[PDB]
């Protein structure tokens, strides 16, 4: 019922992100752990899912939580969150979790060297946070859709 919300990281300005920042309907939760700041830099990829030509990536740059190196959004009813991302280390596979306000994982994905466009169930209205549970994940694209998903 509500319209799709999207954000292509390539539309962001390049640079470090030291304070919480809105990108469309999504919010980047800046690092509070004292380690290397989140930053947007140049990286060329073309999505195998949408064909979108990416030129930047958002380097979350560390293990996160709801208040550290996360991406937050709000859904008004059940939805699907789509994120295209990759491990920042091409040798590694790293978990990105989507959690509710209680910190419970409602969906997860594993991100490796190649980009993965992950569809993550948003089971009910509320606030949700995406973050890595192990080191750096680089994000290219974000989407929240309320359209019915095929099985």
Coordinates of C-alpha atoms in Angstrom, one line a residue:
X1 CA 0.0 0.0 0.0
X2 CA 2.7 2.6 0.8
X3 CA 5.0 3.4 -2.1
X4 CA 8.5 1.9 -2.5
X5 CA 11.4 3.8 -0.9
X6 CA 14.9 3.6 -2.5
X7 CA 18.3 4.9 -2.0
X8 CA 21.3 4.3 -4.3
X9 CA 24.5 5.0 -2.3
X10 CA 26.0 6.3 -5.6
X11 CA 23.8 9.4 -5.1
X12 CA 25.5 10.2 -1.7
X13 CA 28.3 12.6 -1.4
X14 CA 31.7 11.0 -1.1
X15 CA 33.3 11.2 2.4
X16 CA 33.5 10.1 6.0
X17 CA 30.2 10.0 7.9
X18 CA 30.9 10.9 11.6
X19 CA 27.3 11.8 12.6
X20 CA 24.0 10.1 12.0
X21 CA 22.8 11.0 8.5
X22 CA 19.5 10.6 6.6
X23 CA 19.6 9.2 3.0
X24 CA 16.0 9.4 1.8
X25 CA 13.9 7.4 4.3
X26 CA 16.9 5.5 5.6
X27 CA 19.3 6.6 8.4
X28 CA 23.0 5.9 8.7
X29 CA 23.9 5.4 12.3
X30 CA 27.5 6.7 12.7
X31 CA 30.2 4.8 14.5
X32 CA 30.4 5.3 18.3
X33 CA 33.2 2.7 18.9
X34 CA 36.1 5.0 18.2
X35 CA 37.4 2.9 15.2
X36 CA 37.7 3.8 11.5
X37 CA 34.8 6.1 10.6
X38 CA 32.1 5.0 8.2
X39 CA 32.9 6.4 4.8
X40 CA 31.6 6.6 1.2
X41 CA 34.2 6.0 -1.5
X42 CA 34.3 5.2 -5.2
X43 CA 33.8 1.6 -6.4
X44 CA 32.4 0.5 -9.7
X45 CA 29.9 -2.3 -9.9
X46 CA 26.7 -3.1 -11.9
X47 CA 23.9 -4.9 -10.1
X48 CA 23.3 -8.3 -11.6
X49 CA 19.7 -7.9 -10.2
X50 CA 18.6 -4.5 -11.4
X51 CA 21.3 -3.5 -13.8
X52 CA 21.9 -0.3 -11.9
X53 CA 25.3 1.2 -12.4
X54 CA 26.9 1.7 -9.0
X55 CA 29.8 4.1 -8.6
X56 CA 30.0 4.5 -4.8
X57 CA 29.8 2.2 -1.7
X58 CA 29.0 2.9 1.9
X59 CA 31.7 1.2 4.0
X60 CA 30.1 0.5 7.4
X61 CA 33.7 -0.4 8.5
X62 CA 33.0 -2.6 11.5
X63 CA 30.9 -4.9 13.7
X64 CA 27.8 -2.9 14.4
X65 CA 24.7 -2.7 16.6
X66 CA 21.6 -0.5 16.7
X67 CA 23.6 2.5 17.9
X68 CA 26.9 1.8 16.0
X69 CA 27.5 1.4 12.2
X70 CA 23.9 0.6 11.2
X71 CA 21.3 1.5 8.7
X72 CA 17.8 2.2 10.2
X73 CA 14.3 2.5 8.6
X74 CA 10.7 2.4 9.7
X75 CA 8.0 0.2 8.1
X76 CA 4.3 0.9 8.6
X77 CA 3.1 -2.7 7.9
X78 CA 4.8 -5.9 6.7
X79 CA 7.3 -5.3 4.0
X80 CA 10.5 -6.5 2.3
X81 CA 13.9 -4.8 2.8
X82 CA 16.3 -5.2 -0.1
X83 CA 20.0 -4.4 0.3
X84 CA 22.8 -5.0 -2.1
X85 CA 26.1 -5.3 -0.3
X86 CA 29.4 -7.2 -0.1
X87 CA 32.0 -8.2 2.4
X88 CA 34.7 -5.5 2.7
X89 CA 37.3 -8.3 2.7
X90 CA 37.1 -10.4 -0.4
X91 CA 38.3 -13.5 1.4
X92 CA 35.5 -13.3 4.0
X93 CA 31.9 -14.1 4.3
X94 CA 30.2 -11.7 6.8
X95 CA 26.7 -11.7 8.3
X96 CA 24.4 -8.8 8.1
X97 CA 21.4 -8.9 10.4
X98 CA 18.1 -7.0 10.3
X99 CA 16.9 -6.5 13.9
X100 CA 13.7 -5.1 15.4
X101 CA 13.6 -2.6 18.3
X102 CA 14.1 -5.5 20.8
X103 CA 17.4 -6.4 19.0
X104 CA 16.0 -9.7 17.7
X105 CA 17.1 -10.9 14.3
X106 CA 14.1 -10.9 12.0
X107 CA 16.2 -11.7 8.9
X108 CA 19.8 -12.1 8.0
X109 CA 22.1 -12.6 5.0
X110 CA 25.7 -13.6 4.3
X111 CA 27.8 -11.2 2.2
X112 CA 30.9 -12.3 0.4
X113 CA 33.3 -11.0 -2.3
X114 CA 30.7 -10.6 -5.0
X115 CA 27.7 -8.3 -4.4
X116 CA 24.6 -9.9 -3.1
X117 CA 21.1 -8.4 -3.4
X118 CA 19.4 -9.8 -0.3
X119 CA 15.6 -9.7 0.2
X120 CA 14.9 -9.5 4.0
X121 CA 11.5 -10.0 5.5
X122 CA 10.1 -7.1 7.5
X123 CA 7.5 -9.0 9.5
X124 CA 5.5 -6.1 11.0
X125 CA 5.3 -2.4 11.4
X126 CA 8.2 -0.8 13.4
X127 CA 11.8 0.3 13.4
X128 CA 14.5 -1.9 12.0
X129 CA 18.3 -1.8 11.9
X130 CA 20.7 -3.5 9.5
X131 CA 24.3 -4.0 10.6
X132 CA 27.3 -6.4 10.3
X133 CA 27.9 -8.8 13.1
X134 CA 31.5 -9.3 11.9
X135 CA 33.7 -6.5 10.6
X136 CA 33.2 -4.4 7.4
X137 CA 30.2 -4.7 5.0
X138 CA 30.0 -2.3 2.0
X139 CA 26.6 -1.2 1.0
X140 CA 25.5 -0.2 -2.6
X141 CA 21.7 0.0 -2.6
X142 CA 18.7 0.1 -0.3
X143 CA 15.0 -0.5 -0.9
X144 CA 11.9 -0.9 1.2
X145 CA 8.9 -2.3 -0.7
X146 CA 5.4 -3.2 0.4
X147 CA 4.7 -5.1 -2.9
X148 CA 3.5 -8.7 -2.5
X149 CA 6.5 -11.1 -3.0
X150 CA 6.2 -14.3 -5.1
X151 CA 6.9 -17.6 -3.3

